[PDB]
Amino acid sequence: NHKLSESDKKSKLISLYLLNLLSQNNTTKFHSELQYLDKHIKNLEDDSLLSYPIKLDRWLMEGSYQKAWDLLQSGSQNISEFDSFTDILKSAIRDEIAKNTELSYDFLPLSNIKALLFFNNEKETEKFALERNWPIVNSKVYFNNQSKEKADYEDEMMHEEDQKTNIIEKAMDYAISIEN
């Protein structure tokens, strides 16, 4: 609370700040910023400028990648200094969309994947399919949903063997609780 040193470029900085915060992929910081604003209701809705980053944040969660991409491309703000964020944001979405696709399809046409990733040049799509390490046969991309062992650690997962061993130690915990 303070009202007496207010401006309209304020609205544009805080919105640039929410978006900057988004590309980095932290939900908690995002939310935290919204709370900080003078009121929950007044600020979030009233400002045109604030609206763009909340709406993009909802749909990114939702799965509605295409609406959010489309909204940044057509945007007013795109001309200004959402321009800066557009290149980061595009790579982040396209990455998510490639993993959804990797899971969902056994096979899909190359033409289809070039359009979903929001390319329209054949060649770029071959580079991205390769980056992602997908085999491609002719006219089609084939997908392998391709796991490996590990992705950091945290035992109950095997430094040296046996969930059965984790059961023996936790058995000492409940078998000491009996005898005495």
């Binding site: 939702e62 799965g63 509605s64 990648y65 295409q66 609406k67 489309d70 969309i97 959804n100 696709t101 899971l103 969902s104």
Partner: peptide, 10 residues
């Protein structure tokens, strides 16, 4: 309205 395929994938 535009994310019918995306949603099933999601």
């Amino acid at each position: 309205e535009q994310t019918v395929e995306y949603m099933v994938s999601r």
